[PDB]
RNA sequence: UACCUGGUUGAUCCUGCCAGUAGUCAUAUGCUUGUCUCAAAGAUUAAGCCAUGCAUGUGCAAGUAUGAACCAAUGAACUGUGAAACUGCGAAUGGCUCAUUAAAUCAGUUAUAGUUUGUUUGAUGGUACGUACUCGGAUAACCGUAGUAAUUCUAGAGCUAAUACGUGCAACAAACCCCGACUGGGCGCAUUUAUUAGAUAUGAUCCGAUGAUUCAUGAUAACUCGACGGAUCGCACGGCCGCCGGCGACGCAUCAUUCAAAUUUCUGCCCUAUCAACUUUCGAUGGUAGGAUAGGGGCCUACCAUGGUGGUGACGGGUGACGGAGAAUUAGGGUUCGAUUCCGGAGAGGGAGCCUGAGAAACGGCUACCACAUCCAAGGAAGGCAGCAGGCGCGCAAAUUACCCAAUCCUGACACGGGGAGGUAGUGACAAUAAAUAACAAUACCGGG
RNA sequence: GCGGUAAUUCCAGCUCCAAUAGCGUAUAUUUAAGUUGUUGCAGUUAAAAAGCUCGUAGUUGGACCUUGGGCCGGCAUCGUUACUUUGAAGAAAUUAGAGUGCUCAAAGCAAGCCAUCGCUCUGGAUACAUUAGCAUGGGAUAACAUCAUAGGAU
RNA sequence: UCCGCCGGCACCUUAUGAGAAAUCAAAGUCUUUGGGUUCCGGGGGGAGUAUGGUCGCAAGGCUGAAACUUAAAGGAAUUGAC
RNA sequence: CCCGUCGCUCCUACCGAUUGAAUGGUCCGGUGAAGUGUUCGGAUCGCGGUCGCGAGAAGUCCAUUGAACCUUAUCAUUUAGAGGAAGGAGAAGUCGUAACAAGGUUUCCGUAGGUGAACCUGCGGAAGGAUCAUUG
């Protein structure tokens, strides 16, 4: 009340952190970092609860202190560091370069990308204005800021950003006909192609997207993330990429029963 | 202490509002600086929210005043306070606040005018070949020029002395000046 | 805070509105008598579960046929019924499940199936044998007479390996008698 | 399970209530109680009062070791660990309670183009010049003289450090703006003020952003007695003839981000008219100019105007009223409840004022008054369980002065310390789940096909 | 309502009944209660039409205006709402609900399988969530002023 | 005198209507429940009482409780008795 | 069947002389701690050149926030009270018979007066009347 809060109750944790209700009174509060602490997956919830590498809040530390975790091309030790979207969690030694992608149910998935594809990432772009001494800068959506950007780059764009030599390799503008993945709300994790953008003077830029399998859905100007030019994404999607409503999930379970086992 | 809450005020319906909490620090107030025009300058540092610093000027004698028409800013000493829009006892007490009319000596401005326009009021070839160019458009208001002989120019304070610790301002000209002259003449 | 407070919990029987009625009392006593129960609670909880299922089915049947929030849970309810041996293969509609009754549920209890499988001399002997750890479903010992068996496990009920009735060593009574006869 | 039954009569049909019927994560109580699992537990009355013990400290290779410390060594500064102490950081989170509070808190939904933000992540630091191979004075631990009945009460003396404190080279530029020698001053970044560019949308002709800005930003003139612009630490040793050099730690400033707060838009709350007018000279509603604030604003001051709300219930009163998510019962509609573990607010006996700090009007911080209450050598000194456990009291009404950081997480200089947060055992018929107290045969007796 | 010398009702024995490791009692309140009635009560005689009329606010207000028509990146500047459809944003927990043989259950979000130096990318679904706010389509039914000094449209 | 129309005070017969019934052509068109609107009742007493407010010269009028007590009070019709 | 006065007992509430009593709250007024900012002040300390600069405690002045106490008034809650008086209950009663039959004077409303009590009477009204009716 008189200041900041350093505790996060388990029942107050974000939903995509599927945490057992009777597992404790507290959840790991995400540290300050590049991502918004509600759309992030802390490292504690990576070496635990997603991989069986660590078993407690004592071996996550025991393997972070060995400097074994390299997120976004940099060794990180803070166990509650907020890896939030498409961050390259590159585990050295064993080589587990993982892109944090959005499951069709709003979850977080560690898509195992190849090593040479793990040397870059992509970032969404916030406003672009003039800095001190009249030097334009980028100010992406994951805390990153890049000075001297190419003048074609504008707001809401996406940039393919290198890691070892941090410079913009190329970029995709925000326009209709581009692959887009939704990263917020109920439509999280659904890829599609923008059909038209509707503009309301004052607020609420609404984007209408067409799914590959024929479905259509709308969302805000936020929560969307351009992925690739035209209809070809620049990254490997985890699987499915379609909403897959409950009935067809039941059908998949049925055919899994009727095949494979089939007995 | 002094607070800025609406807690003690009354509703727009004229009904008394009760109290459900104590006073809070983040809504405090402080005593006014009550800056004075005096020769013994004194400015005291204040520590404000966030750890930043406010400069509370208790006494000032000089200032940074700008002639907008010629766009020249000079440091000069204030001589008197002649008008105060809000309170008529703030000129009797000679209190430096924003929008308070003051008088500043014209010596720096006379010196700049002489060395720039080549004209005194109140070298081989380049300087003379450039001086008449500035003398071609040289024009001054009669009310502006009549104060150089007197040695003091009417001016207005645009800074907040109790906040920035300084008294800067601009020289009164045009439609402003006579409006105050008709208020200062008697 | 106490984290244990977050565990959900509920009640399973309801008790009747009118406590003293002759016809209802005789009906309940009749059912208890040949289904080998212990009290009216063992039957009231079955009534409660059946009432919940019937209410769900009735709510589903009120919706339009082309409503997915009818198709999905209609399929789920019929799947559960066909899984627990309640609805026959000739009753694959949401209307038949509204016609279910308490004896359908009581016929699927482990005690009832043990009695009807010829392993027990009477439905009370079945309950006694169940509570004495003599019966295993599949490979798992069960000592709960209310265990509702499924169709796929109906062919695996058998006396346990540890049981003297399923190939175990003699109980303490027989061993005591052998000790007495030894000397 | 969308349900009724008894009672007015000599008897009848009604209105109508009394009584009966079932539930309550709803509290007492009474009798009884074998097993398994799961669990509330001094809220109601007194936010009444507290003996006692604990609940917040913290050290990495990497700020400061000479313990007259330990473990090893054998002319060198130290060159292993390290108690104490200085320095830094934290103690504004968590925990507890519901007294005040009825468009007020609060919920959904807005805004900051009206602001502050330690920290985390990314980027960015040319102007000091008017000993830099590295400046100065103290001080703690230590040691020894003490005072007092007394306390992490207190005074002198002698030593010695810094990433403490205080000074000071800031090391080496360019461009530009002004005053100017006939054919020199300014200028890093920060602060304040003023002027000015930021276009339309000499042939060939650069220039961002919003729904919206004199906006982002640039140039100019000046201004400020400017806690700013590294006198800091660890590891590895190398390459060029003394020169140069890596990987890290901590620290200062600006911007963006994250963590947030503050203020704010619209709509929404229980009973009362035996509450119909309320507010305003002294702020009530609005305007102008200031002051103050991190910032908008009658938030405050001077002057001015007479406005603002109300049968669509203002104003006033009651609440055994914290608000919500939610709980019980539910054919549907509904009625009643919501102290309590999740979110928000408020409080630390009652009011008030404030220091430090990025963050407090903080009470396991201070200062004062009021009420209690504690030693005392009677000169003075120290207080805050609505934290955990426990005690008294109040009551119809509520458990151990136990164990532990093993789990969940948080905090610190930190892999390592600590955590009455939290977990574990104890009491527990609040509530709830499953479930023993006999099954079979023969014989005796008695029935039906 | 019972007990005034024959007590089916009190005090006890026997027998029997209901629930059963649970039952009784007191308060509070949900149902019962269509005895608070919007759904959905009543007002001649049972309690309940004002002595009567006028009257502002409130509530409620006649009819009338697209049908035949089959087919089946631009660029404006505009009557406003209620209603209805579709979408978005929407804390978890609780509730409903899919999967899952904790031995069953109340639960939990786990797990399952060849009999592996492992795999199923294992799963950790989905609804509802009044009203108010934002956006898309519809214009039937309704409310406002707009309606003949042309100061109208082109 | 006869016929017809509108408006009014009533009356007679009959439900196929309603109602506890008396009875009602409206007191009908009501579990097959909804045309608009005003007032007003919640078992019988205490009680139209206490007190406050307000109008009146007064008598009084309008508004109007609570503690407590009680298992009935009451409506229509029926058979007796008187 | 049934009504009221009077007599006895208990219970609840009301009026009530006492400028009642107590408790909590608010407005006004007086005193006003303590902190915060400001004015003056200068115990002392450091350095500089037998001369200046800097830091600075106690104290003091004004303003501000303002606890707390002391009177008046007012609001809200509980209660004492001599006396009066009202309801209800009680198996003890006294006095009559007002109502139910044409209740022996038909009954009942509004209003006014009167008397031991139910009640009586004057004026206007009603049938809930003991008359649905005199074209005679
Ligand atoms: K601190
Ligand atoms: K809100
Ligand atoms: K302000
Ligand atoms: K701090
Ligand atoms: Mg906006
Ligand atoms: Mg009852
Ligand atoms: Mg056992
Ligand atoms: Mg310390
Ligand atoms: Mg807290
Ligand atoms: Mg109130
Ligand atoms: Mg509001
Ligand atoms: Mg600008
Ligand atoms: Mg202002
Ligand atoms: Mg004023
Ligand atoms: Mg309260
Ligand atoms: Mg609450
Ligand atoms: Mg509690
Ligand atoms: Mg809370
Ligand atoms: Mg507080
Ligand atoms: Mg206390
Ligand atoms: Mg305090
Ligand atoms: Mg304490
Ligand atoms: Mg505290
Ligand atoms: Mg208890
Ligand atoms: Mg007898
Ligand atoms: Mg009724
Ligand atoms: Mg009557
Ligand atoms: Mg009547
Ligand atoms: Mg009438
Ligand atoms: Mg119409
Ligand atoms: Mg009544
Ligand atoms: Mg007669
Ligand atoms: Mg008589
Ligand atoms: Mg008579």
Q: Which 3-state string (H, E, C) describes B73-138?
A: EEEEEEEEEEEECCCCHHHHCCECCCCEEEEEECHHHHHHHHHHHCCCCCCCCHHHHHHHHHHHCC
A131, B10, C48, C51 from C54: Cα distances, Å: 69, 60, 10, 5
Distance CA C170, CA A250 (A): 50
Query: Furthest-apart CA pair in chain A: how many Å?
Result: 74
Helical residues (DSSP H) of chain C, grouped into ranges: 22-35, 41-61, 68-83, 94-98, 102-106, 110-116, 123-131, 172-182
- DSSP-derived secondary structure for chain A: --S----EEGGGS-TTS---GGG-SEE-PPPSSSS-SSS-EETHHHHTTTSTT--STTHHHHHHTTT--EETSSB---TT-EE-SS-EEE-TTTT--EEEEE-TTS-EEEEE--TGGGGEEEEEB---EE-GGG-EE--BTTS---BS--TT--TT-EEEEESSS--EEEEE---TTSEEEE-SSTTTT-EEEEEEEE--TTS--EEEEEETTS-EEEEESTTEEEEESTT--SS---S--S---HHHHHHHHHHHIIIII--
> B186 CB contacts (<8 Å, ≥6 apart)?
none
Backbone dihedral angles phi then psi of residue B105, each to the nearest 5 degrees: -65, 145
- A and C interact (at least 3 Cβ pairs within 8 A): yes
Which residue is listed with tokens 């049981």?
C163
Distance separating the N- and C-terminal Cα atoms of chain A? 61
Burial track B96-112 (b if 16+ CB lie within 10 A, e otherwise):
bbbebbbbbbbebbbee
Distance A257 CA to E115 C1' (A): 21
Return the closest-CA partner of residue A124 out of A171, A164, A81, A163. Answer: A171
Which residue is listed with tokens 């109290």?
B19
Q: Do A245 and C68 touch (CB under 8 A)?
A: yes
Q: Do C3 and A22 touch (CB under 8 A)?
A: yes
Burial track C18-27 (b if 16+ CB lie within 10 A, e otherwise):
eeeeeeeeee
Q: Do C7 and A24 touch (CB under 8 A)?
A: no
Distance CA C175, CA C161 (A): 18
Chain A: list its partners (3+ Cβ pairs within 8 Å): C
Distance B177 CA to E53 C1' (A): 75
Which uninterrupted H or E stretch holds B178? helix B174-184
- A24 lies within 8 A of chain C by CB: yes
- A19 min Cα distance to partner chain C (Å): 13
Backbone dihedral angles phi then psi of residue A132, each to the nearest 5 degrees: -65, 150
Residue A71 · residue A83 · CB < 8 Å: yes
Q: Are strands A41-42 and A216-220 parallel, antiparallel or unpaired?
A: unpaired
Q: Are strands B53-60 and B62-67 parallel, antiparallel or unpaired?
A: unpaired
Q: Do A22 and C75 touch (CB under 8 A)?
A: no
Which uninterrupted H or E stretch holds B44? strand B42-47
Which uninterrupted H or E stretch holds B55? strand B53-60
A253 is in an annotated binding site: no
Mutation target for A interface from C2, C4, C6: give the one with most A CBs within 10 A. Answer: C6
Distance CA B123, CA B137 (A): 21
Residue C63 · residue C69 · CB < 8 Å: yes
Which residues from C are below 8 Å from A243, CB to CB? none
- C39 lies within 8 A of chain A by CB: no
Chain G nucleotides covered by protein, CB below 7 Å:
35-39, 63-65
Residue B54 · residue B127 · CB < 8 Å: no
Distance CA A90, CA B44 (A): 55
Backbone dihedral angles phi then psi of residue A217, each to the nearest 5 degrees: -150, 155
Q: Which ligand is nearest to the CA of A1?
A: 9
Q: Give the HSE-up count for residue B139: Cα atoms under 13 Å, Cβ half-sphere.
A: 2
Distance CA C125, CA B112 (A): 121
> A208 CB contacts (<8 Å, ≥6 apart)?
A194, A195, A196, A197, A198, A216, A217, A218
Strand partners, A42: A82
Distance CA B178, CA B101 (A): 13
Q: Do A250 and C72 touch (CB under 8 A)?
A: yes
Torsion of Cα atoms, A12 then A14 then A19 then A20, to 10°: 40
Which residue is listed with tokens 């078993």?
A55
Distance CA A68, CA A90 (A): 9
Which residue is listed with tokens 């970032």?
A123
Report how far ligand 12's centroid is from the alpha carbon of C46 (Å): 78
Which residue is listed with tokens 């390799």?
A169
Q: Are strands B36-37 and B53-60 parallel, antiparallel or unpaired?
A: parallel
Residue C87 · residue C96 · CB < 8 Å: yes
Region for C145 from its dihedrals, namely left if φ exceeds 0, alpha if ψ lies in -120 to 50, beta otherwise: alpha
DSSP state of B67: E
By CA distance, what is C5's nearest residue in A?
A22
Which uninterrupted H or E stretch holds B175? helix B174-184
């Amino acid at each position: 009340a008189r200041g900041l809060k350093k505790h996060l109750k388990r029942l107050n944790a974000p939903s995509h952190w599927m945490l057992d209700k009777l597992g404790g009174a507290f959840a790991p509060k995400p540290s300050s970092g590049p991502h918004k602490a509600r759309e992030c997956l802390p490292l504690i919830l990576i070496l635990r609860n997603r991989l069986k590498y660590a078993l407690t809040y004592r071996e996550v530390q025991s393997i972070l202190m060995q400097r074994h975790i390299m997120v976004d091309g940099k060794v990180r030790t803070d166990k509650t560091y907020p890896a939030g979207f498409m961050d390259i969690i590159s585990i050295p030694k064993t080589g587990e370069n993982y892109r944090l992608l959005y499951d069709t149910k709003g979850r977080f998935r560690l898509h195992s990308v190849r090593d040479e594809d793990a040397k870059f990432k992509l970032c969404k772009v916030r406003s672009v204005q003039f800095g001190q001494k009249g030097i334009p800068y980028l100010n992406t959506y994951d805390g990153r800021t890049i000075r001297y950007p190419d003048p074609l780059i504008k707001a809401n764009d996406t940039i393919k950003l290198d890691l070892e030599t941090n410079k913009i390799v190329d970029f995709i503008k925000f326009d209709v006909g581009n692959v887009v993945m939704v990263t917020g709300g109920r439509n999280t994790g659904r890829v599609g192609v923008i059909k038209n953008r509707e503009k309301h003077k004052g607020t609420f830029e609404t984007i209408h997207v067409e799914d590959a399998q024929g479905h259509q859905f709308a969302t805000r100007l936020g929560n969307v993330f351009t992925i690739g030019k035209g209809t070809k994404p620049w990254v490997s999607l985890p699987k499915g990429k379609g909403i897959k409503l409950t009935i067809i999930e039941e059908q998949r379970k049925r055919d899994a029963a009727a095949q494979a086992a089939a007995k | 202490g002094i607070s800025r809450d609406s807690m003690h005020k009354r509703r727009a319906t004229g009904g008394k509002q009760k109290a459900w909490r104590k006073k809070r620090k983040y809504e405090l107030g402080r005593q006014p600086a009550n800056t004075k025009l005096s020769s013994n300058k004194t400015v005291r540092r204040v520590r404000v929210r966030g750890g930043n610093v406010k400069w509370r000027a208790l006494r000032l004698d000089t200032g940074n005043f700008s002639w907008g028409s010629e766009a020249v800013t000079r440091k000069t000493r204030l001589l008197d306070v002649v008008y105060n829009s809000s309170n008529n006892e703030l000129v009797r007490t000679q209190t430096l606040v924003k929008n308070a009319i003051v008088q500043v000596d014209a010596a720096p401005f006379k010196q700049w005018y002489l060395t720039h326009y080549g004209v005194e009021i109140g070298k081989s070839n380049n300087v003379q070949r450039k001086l008449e160019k500035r003398q071609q458009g040289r024009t001054l208001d009669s009310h502006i020029e009549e104060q150089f002989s007197g040695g003091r120019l009417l001016a207005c304070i645009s800074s907040r002395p109790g906040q920035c610790g300084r008294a800067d301002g601009y020289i009164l000209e045009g439609k402003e000046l006579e409006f105050y002259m008709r208020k200062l003449q008697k | 805070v106490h984290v244990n407070f977050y565990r959900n919990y509920g009640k399973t029987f309801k008790k009747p509105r009118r406590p003293y009625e002759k016809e209802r009392l005789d009906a309940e006593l009749k059912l208890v008598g040949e289904y080998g129960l212990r009290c009216k609670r063992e039957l009231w909880r079955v009534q409660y579960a059946l009432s919940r299922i019937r209410n769900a089915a009735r709510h589903l049947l009120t919706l339009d046929e082309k409503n997915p929030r009818r198709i999905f849970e209609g399929a789920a309810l019929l799947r559960r019924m066909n899984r627990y041996g309640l609805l026959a293969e000739g009753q694959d509609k949401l209307d038949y499940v509204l016609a279910l009754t308490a004896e359908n549920f009581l016929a699927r209890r482990l005690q009832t199936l043990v009695f009807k499988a010829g392993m027990a001399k009477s439905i009370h002997h079945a309950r006694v044998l169940i509570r004495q750890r003599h019966i295993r479903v599949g490979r798992q010992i069960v000592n709960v007479p209310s265990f509702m068996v499924r169709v796929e496990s109906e062919k695996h009920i058998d006396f346990s390996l540890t049981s003297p009735f399923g190939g175990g060593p003699a109980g303490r009574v027989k061993r005591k008698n052998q000790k007495k006869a030894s000397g």
